[PDB]
Design a protein around this ligand. Sequence first.
Ligand SMILES: CCOC(=O)CNC(=O)N(Cc1ccc(N)cc1)Cc1cn(C)nn1
Length: 165
Amino acid sequence: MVNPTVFFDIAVDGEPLGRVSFELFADKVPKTAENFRALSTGEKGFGYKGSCFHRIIPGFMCQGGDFTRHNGTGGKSIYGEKFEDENFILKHTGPGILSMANAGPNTNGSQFFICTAKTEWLDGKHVVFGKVKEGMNIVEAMERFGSRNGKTSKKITIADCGQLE
Ligand SMILES: CCOC(=O)CNC(=O)N(Cc1ccc(N)cc1)Cc1cn(C)nn1
C-alpha cells in the first residue's frame, strides 16, 4: 500500500555531499516505480550504484542513470533494454519531480531526471513517477556543478543507493 522510498548518497569528486530520498508513486505508475526501485537496490544484479549525473543544467534538471555507457547513450531497464510509457497521469509541476528520460515514444530504460524547475513542455511525453522527499538542498548543491550545456565541472556520483524503511 505504502509507496516505497529510495535514497541516493551523492558524492562530488569522491567527497560525500549528502543524501537525497525519493517517494516513488507505485500507486499511480507501478511498473515504472518498480524499475527505479529495483535499480536503486541493485537486486537484479545491475543498477545505479556508482553511476553519475552526466548532464546537469541549472534551472532545468539533473539527469543520470546511464550505468552501461556513462554518458547518456545507454542504460537498460529490469524488463529488458526498453519498456513502454506506462501512463502520463502525473505532470512536471516543479522542482523535485522525478521522471524518465527517453529517446522517443516507449523507450524508457534506466535514465531518469530530477527537475529543478517546472518543465511543463515535457508533460505527456516523459513519465513522471516520483518526487524528492528529503534532500532538495542536496539536489540544489549538485545543480551548482552543472553548466548551460550540461557538462559538469566535478564528477557527481551516486556513491550508494537503496531502499529506506
Ligand atoms: C529532460 C529529459 O530529456 C530526455 O530524456 C531527452 N533524452 C535524453 O536526455 N537522453 C537520451 C536517452 C534517454 C533515455 C534512454 N533510455 C536512452 C537515451 C539522454 C541524454 C542525451 N544527452 C545529450 N545527454 N543525455
